């Protein structure tokens, strides 16, 4: 049966360049035209080309002919994508997918688990974490988890010992290149005098763990 | 190129309900357009092809109608594994060119947010920022309207917010708003204040603090 699996993504500053790869297996590879299409996180699909593994016939859409290359090793039943010179707008979810290409032209009828490709020219660093403080019958209160870099963190409550009524936002890419993100929690008013509330981050990129007393 | 033009951005219905999707292309496309459905962190599933076609396994509810330049998914009786986001896409021509999408999320009664303001911490000010947190809780529908005021002054430019997915006990969001100040300013000003705006709420909802208190 048709399985597609991509690799290759990560990590990459301005200008760099990096090549994606797409393992095809289940099927017969030289039968199908293969395709790369890209989704900026929050946005819509982009299709950037297609290969035949047969010959390597290729069609590009215009928008990446300067800067992508597609091309197959068909005795690997494997296709690539070497991105070059990239930039921010190329921060997306790259899947290759299998071609259609039958009425009229091309749609996808089996697609890959997709990599991610950030762009970005921060520098891998673990947050600093502090209070939100519950205001002096329910309280929040909450923990801010600043300045880090690359995505991503978790946070937990008590342990775990917490969950319900437990917030974690997505975080938001600040315009210094680091993410910020918050955690909240909503608790009886009369608990605020007795009941102790710690948040547990852990940040795996830069081995950093942070319990902070709330 | 073809552009593909996706009605409505968003739509919050009930398990049950008649959905239609619409997408339009900029010129005509003949009979095909393919559509998919995608769920949170997954790729897009193949549901229909040349406009009306269902790819072999997709349920009897999922169909799809048009020519031309406008054409419409329908989801006759929504199911709870429904809840996605759909795209069109044309394949009469290359390039390939998508719809912008529909998110289809759980319709449920409206919700006024509950609003905590949070003042920053000791520990930040010694770095020489400080970050003012603004959380708007457990409300619906998603849409809403944070404005951060300084001493009365409306601040413009130096806040991020992010917005959680629908909870998936009481289907609400929540919302945080973050208002960046380097130490300096932040301690030339006293009044720090959150100022709400939500369909919920009969007029805007502020929490605020005094620096200090």
């Known amino acids: 049966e048709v399985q597609l699996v991509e690799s290759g993504g990560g990590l990459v500053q301005p200008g760099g360049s990096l090549r994606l790869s797409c393992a095809a297996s289940?099927?017969?590879?030289?039968?199908?035209?293969m395709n790369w299409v890209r989704q900026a996180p929050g946005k819509g699909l982009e299709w950037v080309g297609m290969?035949?593994?047969?010959?390597?016939?290729?069609r590009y859409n215009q928008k990446f002919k300067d800067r992508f290359t597609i091309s197959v090793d068909k005795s690997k039943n494997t296709l690539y994508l070497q991105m070059n010179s990239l930039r921010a707008e190329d921060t997306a979810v790259y899947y290759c997918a299998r071609g259609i290409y039958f009425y009229g032209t091309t749609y996808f009828d089996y697609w890959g688990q997709g990599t991610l490709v950030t762009v970005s020219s921060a520098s891998t660093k673990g947050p600093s974490v502090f209070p939100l403080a519950p205001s002096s019958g329910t309280a929040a209160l909450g923990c801010l988890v600043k300045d880090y870099f690359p995505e991503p963190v978790t946070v937990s409550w008590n342990s775990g010992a917490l969950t319900s009524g437990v917030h974690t936002f997505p975080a938001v890419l600040q315009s210094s290149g680091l993410y910020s993100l918050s955690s909240v929690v909503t608790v009886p008013s009369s608990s605020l005098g007795t009941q102790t509330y710690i948040c547990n981050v852990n940040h795996k990129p830069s081995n950093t763990k942070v319990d902070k007393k709330v | 190129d073809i552009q593909m033009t996706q009605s409505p951005s968003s739509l919050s219905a009930s398990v049950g309900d008649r959905v239609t999707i619409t997408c339009r292309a900029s010129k005509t496309i003949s009979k095909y357009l393919a559509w998919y459905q995608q769920k949170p962190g997954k790729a897009p599933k193949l549901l229909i092809y040349?406009?009306?076609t269902l790819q072999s396994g997709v349920p009897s509810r999922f169909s799809g109608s048009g020519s031309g330049t406008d054409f419409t998914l329908t989801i006759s009786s929504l199911q709870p594994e429904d809840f996605a986001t759909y795209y069109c896409?044309?394949?009469?021509?290359?390039?390939?060119?998508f719809g912008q999408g529909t998110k289809v999320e759980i319709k449920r009664t409206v919700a006024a947010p509950s609003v905590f303001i949070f003042p920053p911490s000791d520990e930040q000010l010694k770095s020489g920022t400080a970050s003012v947190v603004c959380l708007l809780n457990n409300f619906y529908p998603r849409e809403a309207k944070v404005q951060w005021k300084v001493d009365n002054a409306l601040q413009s430019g130096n806040s991020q917010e992010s917005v959680t997915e629908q909870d998936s006990k009481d289907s609400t969001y929540s919302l945080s708003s973050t208002l960046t100040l380097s130490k300096a300013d932040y301690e030339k000003h006293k009044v720090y204040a959150c100022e709400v705006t939500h369909q919920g709420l009969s007029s805007p909802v502020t929490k605020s603090f005094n620096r200090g208190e």
């Open positions: 040349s406009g009306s």
């Open positions: 290969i035949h593994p047969s010959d390597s016939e290729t």
């Open positions: 896409q044309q394949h009469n021509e290359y390039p390939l060119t």
């Open positions: 289940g099927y017969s590879f030289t039968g199908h035209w």
